[PDB]
Design an enzyme around this catalytic site. Structure first.
Site, PDB file in Angstrom:
ATOM      1  N   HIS A  80       0.803  -1.221   0.000  1.00 20.14           N
ATOM      2  CA  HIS A  80       0.000   0.000   0.000  1.00 20.14           C
ATOM      3  C   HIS A  80       0.848   1.291   0.000  1.00 20.14           C
ATOM      4  CE1 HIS A  80      -3.820  -2.361   1.333  1.00 20.14           C
ATOM      5  NE2 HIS A  80      -3.264  -2.874   0.233  1.00 20.14           N
ATOM      6  N   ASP A  81       2.181   1.146   0.135  1.00 21.03           N
ATOM      7  CA  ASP A  81       3.160   2.236   0.030  1.00 21.03           C
ATOM      8  C   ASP A  81       3.646   2.236  -1.423  1.00 21.03           C
ATOM      9  OD1 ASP A  81       5.416   4.048   0.513  1.00 21.03           O
ATOM     10  OD2 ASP A  81       5.902   3.026   2.377  1.00 21.03           O
TER      11      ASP A  81
END
Ligand SMILES: *[C@@H]1O[C@H](CO[C@@H]2O[C@@H](C)[C@@H](O)[C@@H](O)[C@@H]2O)[C@@H](O[C@@H]2O[C@H](CO)[C@@H](O[C@@H]3O[C@H](CO)[C@@H](O)[C@H](O)[C@@H]3O)[C@H](O)[C@H]2NC(C)=O)[C@H](O)[C@H]1NC(C)=O
Ligand code: HEM
Ligand SMILES: O=c1[nH]c(=S)n(C[C@H]2CCCO2)c2[nH]cnc12
Ligand SMILES: *[C@@H]1O[C@H](CO)[C@@H](O)[C@H](O)[C@H]1NC(C)=O
Ligand SMILES: *[C@@H]1O[C@H](CO)[C@@H](O)[C@H](O)[C@H]1NC(C)=O
Ligand SMILES: OC[C@H]1O[C@@H](O)[C@@H](O)[C@@H](O)[C@@H]1O
Ligand SMILES: [Ca+2]
Ligand SMILES: [Cl-]
Ligand SMILES: [Cl-]
Ligand SMILES: [Cl-]
Lengths: 105, 464
Positions: free
Chosen positions: A95-96
C-alpha cells in the site's frame, strides 16, 4: 526541479532529476515484458467467447481457484517460523508501493 | 455498474462461473470485476497500460498521501506542531485514532448498520480494508505525532512545516529499515536475498524506480499468508472474550471493530502472537478470501485468488513461462517438466488440466504454486520478481536512508536501532512485545520480551 532539497515531494516528482516522473504518482506502470491482449492492444484474454490463448482455451479464474486453490480450512498449516505480523507488513508495504485505480461503480 | 450486473460491457470484465461451482450454482451469475483504468483512455494507438496512483518509493506514502491536496487534509493545520490530524470523535484509551473519511458510498457503514462507524482517512484509500491493516496505519500516525513532539522539544524554533517533514523523513526511513532489514530476508530467503539484493553501494540515477505492472500481481503472493480469523489478545496475551477469533468475512471494512471493540492493542497482540498461514501446494488460500471476500459490502462474496488471475488478464500480463524466461529460469513445456519444477507432479497435472500449456498459467497462480526457497516464503520466480523490484526501489531512490546527504552519519547510526516492536512499545498500551525478528517471533511467552529491555530511537542528533 530544485537544485537542493532535504525532503521528498509528496508526489515523488523530482526524485529522479533526469526523468522527474519516475516513481511519481499517477503515472503508467513500467512493463518488464510486452503486454499480451486478445486483440494485441486492449481486450483481455477471456473477453471473446471461443478465442484461444496460445492454442488453448482460456481457463476461468474461478475454475482455476476451485480446482487448485480450494482446500479444507481445518487442514491449515500454521507457519512455525512466521507471525501474522509478517502477512500484515506485506499488505501495509504493498500500500506504500502500488494502487491500481478502477472507475467508480 | 460492475457490482450490480453480469453484463460484459466497459468498464466491466466479470468472472464467468464454471459448472458444478461449490458456491455459485447459477452459471448466469458472475464475480464482479471493474477493469483497471487505462493510461490512455479510448486510444487506438497505445498498447493498454494501467496507472500507479501512488509513489513507487518506500516513503510511507500510505501514511502521508501521494497527492498534494490529500497530504494537506491529513495534516493538523490548527497549530505549528507539524502533526497529522487525528479522530475528533473517538480515542483508543486516550490514544489517537485516524480521522474519518467522507465517502458518498461508505462500505464501512454497511459492516454494522447500527454502529454507524465510517471508514478512516489515511494516505492510502484502503486503510479500513481489515482492522489489522488499520491498526498498522494508526500505529504509524501516532509515531509521526510522537516524533514531531520530541523534535519540537529539541528544536523549539522549528515551525510546523519543518517538524512535519523531519518526522515524515524519520517514518519513511523506519519503513525502509523494517522492510529491507527484517521483512525481505524472510520473504526471499538468504540465497535470493544475496542474488537480487546485494549490499547497498550508492544511489544510481539510471535505475528506473517505477513499479513494474507484473509486481502488482506477483506481490499478491501474501494472500497465501492470510489466516481465516482476526485474532485479538488481552494484556496477558490470552484470547480476548467474547469474540477472540472473528471470521475475516466479518472484519472487511469493519472500522467499527477498532472504534467500539477494544482499539488497536488486542489486534496488534494477535498479529505478533499468532502464526501466519503457511503456503502449501495443497493449501494455497483460505475460503474467507476465496468464497467470502467482502461478503458484507458486495452483493456476492468475492474470490480473491480468482480476482488476481482475472487482473493479470485485465493488465495483459504474460503467462508463467514468459516470466520464467525473463528471470533466466527453465521454462517447462510438458507435464513431467512442470512436475520437476514444482517438485509436485500431482499439482503439475491439475495446472495442465486447467491451462493446457504452462505458457498460459497466470503469473499469480504459477508463482504461488512453486515450492518455497529455503528460509523464504516464495519460490524462484516470485523471488526474482520481488527481489528485482525491491532492488530498483532502493538503488533508484535519491532519498534512500543510506544515500549520502539524506541523513547525517549520527542519524543513520541512531536509525539502525529502530525496530517495529519498539514502535509498538512507544505508541500503545502494549508493554510485552515480540523479540527481534518480529516477523519470525510468533509464540507467547517464548518469543516475547518487556518493552523496557528495548532500545528507543535516540533523537539527539536531530538537534539543529
Ligand atoms: C547504474 O544502473 C544501471 C542500470 O542497472 C541495471 O538495473 C539494476 C536495477 C540492476 O539489475 C543492474 O544489474 C542492471 O545493470 C547500469 O546500467 C546498465 O548496465 C548494463 C551493463 O553495462 C547495461 O547492459 C548492456 O547492454 C548492452 C545492450 O543494450 C550490451 O551490449 C552490454 O554488453 C550490456 O549488457 C544496461 O543496458 C545498463 N542500463 C541502463 C539503464 O543504463 C549502470 O551500470 C549502473 N551504474 C553503476 C555505477 O552501478
Ligand atoms: C486482509 C488482507 C488482504 C485483503 C482483504 C486483500 C485484498 C485485496 C484485494 C481485494 C485486492 C484487489 C483485487 C482485485 O484485483 O480485484 C488486492 C490487491 C493487492 N494485494 Fe491484497 N489483500 C490482503 C492482503 C495482502 C497481502 C498480505 C499482500 C502482500 C504481501 C497483498 C498485496 C496486494 C497487492 C500488491 C495488490 C495489488 C494492489 C494494487 O492495486 O496495485 N494483499 N488485495
Ligand atoms: O489492493 C486493493 N484493494 C482493494 S480493497 N481495492 C478495492 C476493491 C473494491 C472493489 C474493487 O476492488 C483495490 N482496487 C484496486 N486495488 C485494490
Ligand atoms: C490538532 O492538534 C491539537 C493539539 O495536539 C489537538 O487538540 C487537536 O485535536 C488536533 N486537531 C486535529 C484535527 O487533529
Ligand atoms: C454492531 O454494533 C453494536 C454496537 O454498536 C454491537 O453491540 C453489535 O454486537 C454489533 N453487531 C455484530 C453482529 O457484531
Ligand atoms: O528489467 C529488469 C531486469 O531485466 C533483466 C536484466 O536486464 C536486468 O538487468 C534488469 O534489472
Ligand atoms: Ca510510496
Ligand atoms: Cl510487467
Ligand atoms: Cl486492500
Ligand atoms: Cl501487553
Amino acid at each position: 526541479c530544485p537544485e537542493q532539497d532535504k525532503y521528498r515531494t509528496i508526489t515523488g516528482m523530482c526524485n529522479n532529476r533526469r526523468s522527474p516522473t519516475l516513481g511519481a504518482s499517477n503515472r503508467a506502470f513500467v512493463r518488464w515484458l510486452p503486454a499480451e491482449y486478445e486483440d494485441g492492444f486492449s481486450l483481455p484474454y477471456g473477453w471473446t467467447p471461443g478465442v484461444k490463448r496460445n492454442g488453448f482455451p482460456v481457463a476461468l479464474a474461478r475454475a482455476v481457484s476451485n480446482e487448485i486453490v480450494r482446500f479444507p480450512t481445518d487442514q491449515l498449516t500454521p507457519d512455525q517460523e512466521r507471525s501474522l505480523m509478517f502477512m500484515q507488513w506485506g499488505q501495509l508495504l504493498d500500500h506504500d508501493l502500488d494502487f491500481t485505480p478502477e472507475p467508480a461503480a | 455498474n460492475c457490482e450490480t450486473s453480469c453484463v460484459q460491457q466497459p468498464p466491466c470484465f466479470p468472472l464467468k462461473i464454471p459448472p458444478n461451482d461449490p458456491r455459485i450454482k447459477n452459471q448466469a451469475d458472475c464475480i464482479p470485476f471493474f477493469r483497471s483504468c487505462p493510461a490512455c483512455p479510448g486510444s487506438n494507438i497505445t498498447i493498454r497500460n494501467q496507472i500507479n496512483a501512488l509513489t513507487s518509493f518506500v516513503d510511507a506514502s500510505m501514511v502521508y498521501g501521494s497527492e498534494e491536496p490529500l497530504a494537506r487534509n491529513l495534516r493538523n493545520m490548527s497549530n505549528q506542531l507539524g502533526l497529522l490530524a487525528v479522530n475528533q470523535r473517538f480515542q483508543d484509551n486516550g490514544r489517537a485514532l485516524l480521522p474519518f473519511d467522507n465517502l458518498h458510498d461508505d462500505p464501512c457503514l454497511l459492516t454494522n448498520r447500527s454502529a454507524r462507524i465510517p471508514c478512516f482517512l489515511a494516505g492510502d484509500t484502503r486503510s479500513s480494508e481489515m482492522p489489522e491493516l488499520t491498526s498498522m496505519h494508526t500505529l504509524l500516525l501516532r509515531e509521526h505525532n510522537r516524533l514531531a513532539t520530541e523534535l519540537k522539544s529539541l528544536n523549539p524554533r522549528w515551525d510546523g512545516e519543518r517538524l512535519y517533514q523531519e518526522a515524515r523523513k524519520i517514518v519513511g526511513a523506519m519503513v525502509q529499515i523494517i522492510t529491507y532489514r527484517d521483512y525481505l530476508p524472510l520473504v526471499l530467503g538468504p540465497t535470493a536475498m544475496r542474488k537480487y539484493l546485494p549490499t547497498y553501494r550508492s544511489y544510481n540515477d539510471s535505475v528506473d524506480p517505477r513499479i513494474a505492472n507484473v509486481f502488482t500481481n506477483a506481490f499478491r503472493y501474501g494472500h497465501t499468508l492470510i489466516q481465516p480469523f482476526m485474532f485479538r489478545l488481552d494484556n496477558r496475551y490470552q484470547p480476548m472474550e467474547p469474540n477472540p477469533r472473528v471470521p475475516l468475512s466479518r472484519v472487511f471494512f469493519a472500522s467499527w471493530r477498532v472504534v467500539l471493540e477494544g482499539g488497536i492493542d488486542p489486534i496488534l497482540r494477535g498479529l505478533m502472537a499468532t502464526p501466519a498461514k503457511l503456503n502449501r501446494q495443497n493449501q494455497i488460500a483460505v475460503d474467507e478470501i476465496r468464497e467470502r471476500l467482502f461478503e458484507q459490502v458486495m452483493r456476492i462474496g468475492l474470490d480473491l485468488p480468482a480476482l488476481n488471475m482475472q487482473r493479470s488478464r485485465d493488465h495483459g500480463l504474460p503467462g508463467y513461462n514468459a516470466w520464467r524466461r525473463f528471470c533466466g529460469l527453465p521454462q517447462p513445456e510438458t507435464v513431467g517438466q512442470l512436475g520437476t519444477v514444482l517438485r509436485n507432479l500431482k499439482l503439475a497435472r491439475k495446472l495442465m488440466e486447467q491451462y493446457g500449456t504452462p505458457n498460459n498459467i497466470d503469473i499469480w497462480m504459477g508463482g504461488v504454486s512453486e515450492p518455497l526457497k529455503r528460509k523464504g516464503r516464495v519460490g524462484p520466480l516470485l523471488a526474482c520478481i520481488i527481489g528485482t523490484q525491491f532492488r530498483k526501489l532502493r538503488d533508484g531512490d535519491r532519498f534512500w536512508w543510506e544515500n549520502e546527504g539524506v541523513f547525517s552519519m549520527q542519524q543513520r547510526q541512531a536509525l539502525a536501532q529502530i525496530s517495529l516492536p519498539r514502535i509498538i512499545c512507544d505508541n500503545t498500551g502494549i508493554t510485552t512485545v515480540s523479540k527481534n525478528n518480529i516477523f519470525m517471533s510468533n509464540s507467547y511467552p517464548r518469543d516475547f520480551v518487556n518493552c523496557s529491555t528495548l532500545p528507543a530511537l535516540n533523537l539527539a542528533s536531530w538537534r539543529e
